[PDB]
Symmetry: C2
Subunit: 252 residues, 2 copies
């Protein structure tokens, strides 16, 4: 009896850890969810890589009907594959909670997550990131409030974009932020497309200027910069994200 | 030719991605550093898993003398292994910048990071974490100021503890914070030992009370809680971190 949460990493089947791959091969039953995020890989591709069957679970199986998955783990060794690192999405912590409360032992096999990837692709300092927010298809005052609060303590803001029913692009998120608060248009930001693919599109400029960029296909994430930049951060954005020269005004 | 940064993940040799392992096998030269963090495995145990020699680099090789590693990568396929993810420290982005300026192609194979593993072990919401800080063995007002700035926006604080010359434990970190600002003693915090080991020691209590816990050997990390908690965070801290009932006052 066991429920193991296994991170898939960011892009394809080889992003799983060796420990994770071993856990999936050892598992009695293997499930996957593509609600909290998604990978390039399809379920057949995963099946050929693992050499065993993989069953896709939907949103209801992770929320209201989470008891079903947990019931399977009362008599078998079950694996739930999640894009990225398990528990970055709050959903998983609730599943784990329910499971432990029902006496089912859990285990988490960690994966690489998008925040991390954004730091290596941009050169922004991970310790400088403040709270994150999700820009939803439905208007909200939340992303703007989080950005302002983070700027108040000189911290960056990682923005995740809506995935459902269709993935939102950086262009739509810029529009959304500016509609909510006109002052967002001149804040410097970085758009990142397909983080983890190795063929990312990364561009830093004033927010409104990111609508001019062809970010390619989703998934997309954005970063709104802090009030200031460390000189190393400035140098890295200039080299990795094609930032304009006037970004140096953020360096104190 | 190629300079690939590869995260090792959190605890042992199998924490590396399958892509990371293939990159190490395809590389001409493989280097590792235990300066930014470290895993349980020794250099010899990595060499056994990769089936090839792995050369350990020191701080000077990663900082002022990084041009040496970059020169190797101009004619060979080079891998630099780093505990956790390679760019969660700030050390490594400087190497990447220097390499790209010299026209050397770089690639990053991401790994699991502590910065995200604490959420799975505690039930704290990742989106509520604010800026992180490192508690150094020497006195500094930095960690306390970061904690305070994060609580001003109602955010959690991840605290990394000094690794040199030896790794700092939660007990010493508590002493340090309370010496810097006595009010730190009553703030709720979570001590986490050996995150990623699967055998972690996790405990949530007022800061001063964490000195009562036997967290065992390093490495240790801590979280200082935000001003309030979501009800689900409280529920998870009570089930996973043996939090005291009085923590519900933060809900």
């Amino acid at each position: 009896s066991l429920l193991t949460f296994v991170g898939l990493g960011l892009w394809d089947v080889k992003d799983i850890s060796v420990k994770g791959l071993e856990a999936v091969r050892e598992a009695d039953e293997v499930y996957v969810e593509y609600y909290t995020s998604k990978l390039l890989s399809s379920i057949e591709e995963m099946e050929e890589f693992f050499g065993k069957r993989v069953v896709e679970l939907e949103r209801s199986d992770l929320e209201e009907n989470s008891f079903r998955l947990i019931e399977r783990a009362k008599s078998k060794s079950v694996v739930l594959l999640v894009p990225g690192d398990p528990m970055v999405a709050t959903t998983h912590s609730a599943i784990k909670l329910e499971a432990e409360r029902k006496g089912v032992k859990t285990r988490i096999i960690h994966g690489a997550s998008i925040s991390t990837a954004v730091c290596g692709l941009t050169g922004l300092h991970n310790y400088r990131f403040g709270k994150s927010a999700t820009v939803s298809w439905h208007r909200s005052q939340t992303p703007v409030n989080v950005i302002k609060a983070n700027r108040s303590i000189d911290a960056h803001t990682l923005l995740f974009l809506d995935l459902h029913p269709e993935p939102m692009t950086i262009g739509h998120a810029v529009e959304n932020l500016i509609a909510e608060d006109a002052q967002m248009k001149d804040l410097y930001a970085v758009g990142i497309a397909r983080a983890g693919s190795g063929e990312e599109v990364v561009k830093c400029d004033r927010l409104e200027n990111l609508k001019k960029i062809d970010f390619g296909k989703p998934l997309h994430v954005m970063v709104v910069l802090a009030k200031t930049l460390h000189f190393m951060e400035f140098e890295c954005l200039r080299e990795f994200a094609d930032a304009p020269a006037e970004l140096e005004r953020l360096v104190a």
